[PDB]
Design a protein around this ligand. Structure first.
Ligand SMILES: Nc1ncnc2c1ncn2[C@H]1C[C@H](O)[C@@H](CO[P@](O)(=S)OP(=O)(O)OP(=O)(O)O)O1
Ligand SMILES: [Ca+2]
Ligand SMILES: [Mn+2]
Length: 428
DNA sequence: ATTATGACGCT
DNA sequence: AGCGTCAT
């Protein structure tokens, strides 16, 4: 009882942009606003591959990883914006720069952890404490939470009507005398996230969703519950009902083989069902670390910190060469290594000026035709100068005798992927 | 021919 | 180090 940790020590949010690359293109081109539209990479093969989809277009069944020609079968009036191509490859700079706009605004409110190009975790624990005793124990008005859902409420017929009804039940039950009530802390966190999201939209034009809970996994889960342009508070008390029908694969890190093994080995389907195993039972099947993590996580408890990191730790350039485009000659491999290295140099040089740091290691990865995996081979060398010709020459030297062909001018087996990655940054 | 990334774990 | 997993 008195000694049972409940994982209610922190207030953590996750802010995730709505259909991010699409909003970037819609800001630039007003003709795309409020339309079914998608962002596509390349064009010659099946109209290009879709990587982002507006909510209007999702209503027609358009999804990521769909060919545009196929999306057009579902949505004939679908509008498209193409990813920039430079040096023969897709170039994501516009979206990385739009990401920085958003991350810099979020950083004004609290320290953030960049979790992807379009989302960040926020540790709001300290900000909440400050706002709380600036409030003098004043009640929190529904007006301060105009886009907030309280997961699990109302309990005991507009969609907005349901939202407000749930919010009212929550606020009516809130205890404001205690400055250490976890539920109150989450509520103040939600107030701050409304402010953050309003600042993002005002200053960039971009809308986003957010989750507010006591840890990163619940905040991420919460965020997705009421997308787009809304935020969701998942309280500790909401967890048993929420998890009672929550497929295991929906929890971050359980979407792959581990999650499948939990389902298989234990013969369960939902996150809540994990509570019926001992910590040692879970460790026996899934390992010491995973076992302890699952034991806590199915009770809504997780301790992974919000890391103070706003900038990516690596800067990489990659390109696939599928089917008959697979690289089969030396000069082909060399030319594409150079294209990659030139984009990498551009990004590295910018990074050095912006962020006062230098990469020290170059990682070279390839895939060969007929191979199992994402990467067939990974090798490193020293990154001593931001020079594309040197980096491409060094990458070639490193992947040199992967070529099994006796013919030296020819390359076999053909390469279906090249990847250059700058790593191991040092302050400068 | 589901591409371009990017973080972290294992040994 | 080099490979694997999982995520966006
Ligand atoms: N698998 C993959 N390949 C290439 N690019 C991706 C992929 N997944 C996501 N992205 C890009 C393009 C997205 O706009 C952006 C953010 O991804 P997410 O958050 S999964 O989806 P969004 O497009 O922002 O819609 P949503 O968050 O509102 O559901 O990253
Ligand atoms: Ca998003
Ligand atoms: Mn995202």
């Amino acid at each position: 009882g008195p000694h049972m940790a409940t994982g209610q020590d922190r207030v953590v949010a996750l802010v995730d942009m709505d259909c991010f690359f699409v909003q970037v293109e819609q800001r630039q081109n007003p003709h795309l606003r409020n339309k079914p539209c998608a962002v596509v990479q390349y064009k010659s093969w099946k109209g290009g591959g879709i990587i982002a989809v507006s909510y209007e277009a999702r209503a027609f069944g358009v999804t990521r990883s769909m060919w545009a020609d196929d999306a057009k079968k579902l949505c004939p009036d679908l509008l498209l914006a193409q990813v920039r191509e430079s040096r023969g490859k897709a170039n994501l700079t516009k979206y990385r720069e739009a990401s920085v706009e958003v991350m810099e605004i979020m950083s004004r409110f609290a320290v953030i952890e960049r979790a992807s190009i379009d989302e960040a975790y926020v540790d709001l624990t300290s900000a909440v404490q400050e706002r709380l005793q600036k409030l003098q124990g004043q009640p929190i008005s529904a007006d301060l939470l105009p886009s907030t859902y309280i997961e699990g409420l109302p309990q005991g017929v507009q969609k907005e009507g349901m939202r407000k009804q749930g919010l009212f039940q929550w606020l009516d039950s809130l205890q404001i005398d205690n400055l250490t009530s976890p539920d109150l802390q989450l509520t103040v966190g939600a107030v701050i996230v409304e402010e953050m999201r309003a600042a993002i939209e005002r200053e960039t034009g971009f809308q986003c969703s957010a989750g507010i809970s006591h840890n990163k996994v619940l905040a991420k889960l919460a965020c997705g519950l009421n997308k787009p342009n809304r935020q969701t508070l998942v309280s500790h008390g909401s967890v048993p009902q929420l998890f009672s029908q929550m497929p295991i694969r929906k929890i971050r890190s359980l979407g792959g083989k581990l999650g499948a093994s939990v389902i298989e080995i234990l013969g369960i389907e939902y996150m809540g069902e994990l509570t019926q195993f001992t910590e040692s039972q879970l460790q026996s099947h899934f390992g010491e670390k995973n076992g302890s993590w699952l034991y806590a996580m199915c009770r809504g408890i997780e301790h992974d910190p919000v890391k103070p990191r706003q900038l990516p730790k690596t800067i990489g350039c990659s390109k696939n060469f599928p089917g008959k485009t697979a690289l089969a000659t030396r000069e082909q491999v060399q030319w594409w290594l150079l294209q990659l290295a030139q984009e990498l140099e551009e990004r590295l040089t910018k990074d050095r000026n912006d962020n006062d740091r230098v990469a020290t290691q170059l990682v070279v990865s390839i895939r060969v035709q007929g191979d199992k995996r994402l990467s067939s081979l990974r090798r490193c060398c020293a990154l001593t100068r931001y020079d594309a010709h040197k980096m491409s020459h060094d990458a070639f030297t490193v992947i040199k005798n992967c070529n099994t062909s006796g013919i030296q001018t020819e390359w076999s087996p053909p390469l279906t992927m090249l990847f250059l990655c700058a790593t191991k940054f040092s302050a400068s």
